[PDB]
Write an enzyme that holds these catalytic residues in place. Structure first.
Site, PDB file in Angstrom:
ATOM      1  N   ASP A  15       0.804  -1.255   0.000  1.00 47.36           N
ATOM      2  CA  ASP A  15       0.000   0.000   0.000  1.00 47.36           C
ATOM      3  C   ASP A  15       0.821   1.281   0.000  1.00 47.36           C
ATOM      4  O   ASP A  15       0.244   2.358   0.165  1.00 47.36           O
ATOM      5  CB  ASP A  15      -1.025   0.006   1.154  1.00 47.36           C
ATOM      6  CG  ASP A  15      -0.391  -0.183   2.501  1.00 47.36           C
ATOM      7  OD1 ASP A  15       0.828   0.185   2.642  1.00 47.36           O
ATOM      8  OD2 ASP A  15      -1.131  -0.663   3.391  1.00 47.36           O
ATOM      9  N   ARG A  29       0.836   6.762   0.144  1.00 41.62           N
ATOM     10  CA  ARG A  29       0.095   5.777   0.878  1.00 41.62           C
ATOM     11  C   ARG A  29      -1.297   5.684   0.258  1.00 41.62           C
ATOM     12  O   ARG A  29      -1.990   6.677   0.174  1.00 41.62           O
ATOM     13  CB  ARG A  29       0.000   6.214   2.351  1.00 41.62           C
ATOM     14  CG  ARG A  29      -0.879   5.317   3.215  1.00 41.62           C
ATOM     15  CD  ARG A  29      -0.423   3.876   3.268  1.00 41.62           C
ATOM     16  NE  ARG A  29      -1.020   3.098   4.361  1.00 41.62           N
ATOM     17  CZ  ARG A  29      -2.165   2.434   4.268  1.00 41.62           C
ATOM     18  NH1 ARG A  29      -2.875   2.431   3.138  1.00 41.62           N
ATOM     19  NH2 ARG A  29      -2.579   1.712   5.310  1.00 41.62           N
ATOM     20  N   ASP A  34      -5.745  -1.328   3.633  1.00 37.62           N
ATOM     21  CA  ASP A  34      -4.647  -1.747   4.454  1.00 37.62           C
ATOM     22  C   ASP A  34      -4.130  -3.085   3.960  1.00 37.62           C
ATOM     23  O   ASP A  34      -4.841  -4.049   3.997  1.00 37.62           O
ATOM     24  CB  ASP A  34      -5.105  -1.793   5.898  1.00 37.62           C
ATOM     25  CG  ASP A  34      -3.937  -1.938   6.895  1.00 37.62           C
ATOM     26  OD1 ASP A  34      -2.861  -1.374   6.679  1.00 37.62           O
ATOM     27  OD2 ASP A  34      -4.158  -2.600   7.887  1.00 37.62           O
ATOM     28  N   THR A  35      -2.929  -3.119   3.428  1.00 39.69           N
ATOM     29  CA  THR A  35      -2.260  -4.390   3.058  1.00 39.69           C
ATOM     30  C   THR A  35      -1.531  -4.886   4.325  1.00 39.69           C
ATOM     31  O   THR A  35      -1.165  -4.087   5.204  1.00 39.69           O
ATOM     32  CB  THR A  35      -1.269  -4.180   1.901  1.00 39.69           C
ATOM     33  OG1 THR A  35      -0.409  -3.062   2.181  1.00 39.69           O
ATOM     34  CG2 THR A  35      -2.032  -3.946   0.560  1.00 39.69           C
ATOM     35  N   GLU A  37       1.663  -5.913   6.444  1.00 35.67           N
ATOM     36  CA  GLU A  37       3.111  -5.600   6.358  1.00 35.67           C
ATOM     37  C   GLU A  37       3.849  -6.795   5.689  1.00 35.67           C
ATOM     38  O   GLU A  37       3.355  -7.938   5.726  1.00 35.67           O
ATOM     39  CB  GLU A  37       3.713  -5.314   7.756  1.00 35.67           C
ATOM     40  CG  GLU A  37       3.067  -4.175   8.584  1.00 35.67           C
ATOM     41  CD  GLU A  37       2.953  -2.852   7.850  1.00 35.67           C
ATOM     42  OE1 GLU A  37       3.917  -2.492   7.164  1.00 35.67           O
ATOM     43  OE2 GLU A  37       1.882  -2.192   7.917  1.00 35.67           O
ATOM     44  N   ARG A  75       3.432  11.424   3.914  1.00 35.73           N
ATOM     45  CA  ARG A  75       3.096  10.574   2.767  1.00 35.73           C
ATOM     46  C   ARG A  75       1.916  11.152   2.113  1.00 35.73           C
ATOM     47  O   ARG A  75       0.984  11.528   2.795  1.00 35.73           O
ATOM     48  CB  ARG A  75       2.762   9.112   3.161  1.00 35.73           C
ATOM     49  CG  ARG A  75       3.873   8.408   3.916  1.00 35.73           C
ATOM     50  CD  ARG A  75       3.516   6.997   4.287  1.00 35.73           C
ATOM     51  NE  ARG A  75       2.380   6.924   5.208  1.00 35.73           N
ATOM     52  CZ  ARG A  75       1.907   5.800   5.726  1.00 35.73           C
ATOM     53  NH1 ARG A  75       2.506   4.611   5.482  1.00 35.73           N
ATOM     54  NH2 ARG A  75       0.807   5.871   6.478  1.00 35.73           N
TER      55      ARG A  75
HETATM   56  C1  LIG Z   1      -4.318   5.367   5.030  1.00 37.46           C
HETATM   57  C2  LIG Z   1      -4.067   6.484   5.985  1.00 37.46           C
HETATM   58  C3  LIG Z   1      -3.198   6.293   7.058  1.00 37.46           C
HETATM   59  N1  LIG Z   1      -2.937   7.268   7.952  1.00 37.46           N
HETATM   60  C4  LIG Z   1      -2.066   7.089   9.104  1.00 37.46           C
HETATM   61  C5  LIG Z   1      -2.928   6.550  10.253  1.00 37.46           C
HETATM   62  C6  LIG Z   1      -2.050   5.477  10.879  1.00 37.46           C
HETATM   63  O1  LIG Z   1      -1.341   6.045  12.016  1.00 37.46           O
HETATM   64  P1  LIG Z   1      -0.324   5.212  12.952  1.00 37.46           P
HETATM   65  O2  LIG Z   1       1.049   5.179  12.325  1.00 37.46           O
HETATM   66  O3  LIG Z   1      -0.363   6.196  14.082  1.00 37.46           O
HETATM   67  O4  LIG Z   1      -0.962   3.893  13.129  1.00 37.46           O
HETATM   68  C7  LIG Z   1      -1.067   5.048   9.810  1.00 37.46           C
HETATM   69  C8  LIG Z   1      -1.322   3.715   9.094  1.00 37.46           C
HETATM   70  O5  LIG Z   1      -0.441   3.613   7.973  1.00 37.46           O
HETATM   71  P2  LIG Z   1       0.211   2.184   7.617  1.00 37.46           P
HETATM   72  O6  LIG Z   1      -0.892   1.198   7.512  1.00 37.46           O
HETATM   73  O7  LIG Z   1       1.034   2.445   6.396  1.00 37.46           O
HETATM   74  O8  LIG Z   1       1.087   1.893   8.771  1.00 37.46           O
HETATM   75  O9  LIG Z   1      -1.142   6.040   8.843  1.00 37.46           O
HETATM   76  C9  LIG Z   1      -3.665   8.472   7.878  1.00 37.46           C
HETATM   77  O10 LIG Z   1      -3.416   9.344   8.764  1.00 37.46           O
HETATM   78  N2  LIG Z   1      -4.524   8.700   6.882  1.00 37.46           N
HETATM   79  C10 LIG Z   1      -4.801   7.761   5.948  1.00 37.46           C
HETATM   80  O11 LIG Z   1      -5.623   8.025   5.051  1.00 37.46           O
HETATM   81 CA   LIG Z   2      -0.097  -1.510   5.897  1.00 38.62          CA
END
Ligand SMILES: Cc1cn([C@H]2C[C@H](OP(=O)(O)O)[C@@H](COP(=O)(O)O)O2)c(=O)[nH]c1=O
Ligand SMILES: [Ca+2]
Length: 129
Positions: A15, A29, A34-35, A37, A75
């Site tokens: 993702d 991103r 959500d993929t 890890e 991102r």
């Molecule tokens: C997809 C997405 C993730 N994020 C943030 C929330 C999550 O915070 P935390 O890092 O605090 O969990 C994290 C998840 O991304 P990943 O799934 O790449 O880790 O990215 C956003 O803020 N907005 C979004 O639209």
């Molecule tokens: Ca992920």
């Protein structure tokens, strides 16, 4: 919403990916998904799927929603298209991603992806097997 040009710099995982957008390198991103890890179950297959889809594409496009365009990590948050086909949707359809992180103001394609997840879940594909 509208599609904007970008070019692949490098695949990263299911993702996220490094694209050049308005001439600058950025990590993107994917919205609404959500993929797993890389170290989790189906993580390697997600990364493989996304990597092939974006590497084989002739044209990469990004589509921002109406809300926040960058996350707290810097991102970019967008829908990503490879030769007109939405990566976010294809991941969901194949059971390599779950619909996730559905925030208000940034959820235009929610119901499209939920339809794709239902189909994946019926077919018992990958994450749903
Ligand atoms: C997809 C997405 C993730 N994020 C943030 C929330 C999550 O915070 P935390 O890092 O605090 O969990 C994290 C998840 O991304 P990943 O799934 O790449 O880790 O990215 C956003 O803020 N907005 C979004 O639209
Ligand atoms: Ca992920």
């Amino acid at each position: 919403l509208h599609k904007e040009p970008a070019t692949l710099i490098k695949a990263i995982d299911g993702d996220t990916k490094k694209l050049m957008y308005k001439g600058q390198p950025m990590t993107f991103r994917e919205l609404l998904v959500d993929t797993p890890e890389f170290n989790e179950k189906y993580g390697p297959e997600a990364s493989a799927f996304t990597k092939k889809m974006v590497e084989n594409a002739k044209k990469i496009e990004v589509e921002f929603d109406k809300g926040q365009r960058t996350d707290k990590y810097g991102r970019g948050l967008a829908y990503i298209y490879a030769d007109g086909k939405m990566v976010n949707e294809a991941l969901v359809r194949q059971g390599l991603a779950k619909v996730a992180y559905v925030y208000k103001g940034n959820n235009t394609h929610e119901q499209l992806l939920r339809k794709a997840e239902a189909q994946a879940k019926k077919e018992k594909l990958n994450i749903w097997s």
